[PDB]
Amino acid sequence: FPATV
Amino acid sequence: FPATV
Amino acid sequence: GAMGSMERASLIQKAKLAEQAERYEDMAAFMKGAVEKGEELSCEERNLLSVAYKNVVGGQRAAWRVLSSIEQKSNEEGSEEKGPEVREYREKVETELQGVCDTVLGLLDSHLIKEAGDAESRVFYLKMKGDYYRYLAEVATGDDKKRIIDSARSAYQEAMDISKKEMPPTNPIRLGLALNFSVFHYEIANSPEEAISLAKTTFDEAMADLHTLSEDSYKDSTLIMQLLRDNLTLWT
Amino acid sequence: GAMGSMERASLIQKAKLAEQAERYEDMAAFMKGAVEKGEELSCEERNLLSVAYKNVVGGQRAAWRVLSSIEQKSNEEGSEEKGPEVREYREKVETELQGVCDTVLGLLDSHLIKEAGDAESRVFYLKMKGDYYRYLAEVATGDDKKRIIDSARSAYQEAMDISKKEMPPTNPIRLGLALNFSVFHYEIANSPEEAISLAKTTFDEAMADLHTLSEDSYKDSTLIMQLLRDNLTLWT
């Protein structure tokens, strides 16, 4: 899964 | 803390 | 609301305690109470709100993905029929997730966004709006999936427009917004090229402005830049 | 009860799904429903019950310890007065923890223990009884602390007596019971010598019986033996 903040 | 199961 | 009798300051104090105890459901409930006092939130308080709900929904999303994978496997050729339980339990988790999203969206709509005039607050809340519509989109399969996706897109786009006009390219909120909108494009909108372009342009424009920053600001901006790079590496 | 309408088998199925999703509150609620169907539990089902509640209460205990440490610090000389919030929130977590313990004890009393005739089931449930009274003891400070401690001791002792008569010294339930009763002695009963003696004797008697075991049984027994050794290393 890609990075989110 | 000591081990418990 | 169960928090109606508690002082605003006490709710904020307890949210911080809950964070230290990794009690994120409690943290979120305290912050919901604090928002419902009706006053605007400070930066620190906005962060408490976001951290609480990010952690609650993050756990729900992870559980939903486990259950959805089991369910998909159950519907493959040669899979033995095991009854409605997997679907039921995935639906239970899904419904609880949708509830949390609806709660957050509700706080934003009543009345955090409309009272937020400074760019930093407004962009922060609009990013949240995009994020929680994105989580709704992740689980949407019906007649409203398109409208949910568009709601996320619209919130992100308003936030991007304000951020580009009002904030430097290294601002952590601007960077995090772009990171997340890029993921929206890749994972939700079936637009990997747009995702990659946004991440690259955001990274490069931030790089060019790092020279203006103090050591402490540099730390934060570079951390998010690395997340952009990490996604780009994943996608290329 | 909210699980009254769900089939026993479906509750068990969903408990297993909840475990895979790391949804331990759900897992516990499903297993409570399953117990309340009124039938005895199989070994696998007893394990689901114990795992669910161990994880729920384990998280509560960790949170309680964080909050108790903050509270203790607040009551040191030179600490600035911050109002009742720390105590209130510690009390909230504590009350929820006590509730979970009371729920488990309630299931054991109505009617798991009384229907458990085989040594393996009876010892398993009596160990649980000791464990959940031990968790109540950890947070007890009032007129009943002594009686809570004695309740834990009595449950553990009955389990030890049955286990010594009916189970080999390598049996994992017997070993885990002894491990936990030893921790009770050290942490709750202010009896570190008894704790150390029990752990050592349990370890040595298990060592002597390993030769009787298959590879798979050996694996389980040796894992718990290592926990005994780990405690002994901590304590000596």
Ligand SMILES: *CC(=O)NCC1CCN(C(=O)C2(Oc3ccc(Cl)cc3)CCCCC2)CC1
């Ligand atoms: C009130 C306010 O300005 N809040 C935003 C800051 C931004 C920095 N930050 C972080 O925790 C990290 O970055 C973001 C977090 C959340 C958002 Cl919306 C954007 C950025 C977390 C990732 C690594 C850099 C720091 C504290 C809250």
Ligand SMILES: *CC(=O)NCC1CCN(C(=O)C2(Oc3ccc(Cl)cc3)CCCCC2)CC1
């Ligand atoms: C129905 C039944 O026989 N349950 C007991 C087993 C024992 C082995 N085990 C474990 O998960 C480990 O050991 C224990 C867990 C729980 C208890 Cl009460 C005793 C031992 C966990 C620790 C390392 C060895 C295996 C499965 C359940």
Ligand SMILES: [Mg+2]
């Ligand atoms: Mg007030």
Ligand SMILES: [Mg+2]
């Ligand atoms: Mg649904």
Ligand SMILES: [Mg+2]
């Ligand atoms: Mg553009």
Ligand SMILES: [Mg+2]
């Ligand atoms: Mg039936």
Ligand SMILES: [Mg+2]
């Ligand atoms: Mg109390």
Ligand SMILES: [Mg+2]
């Ligand atoms: Mg003895």
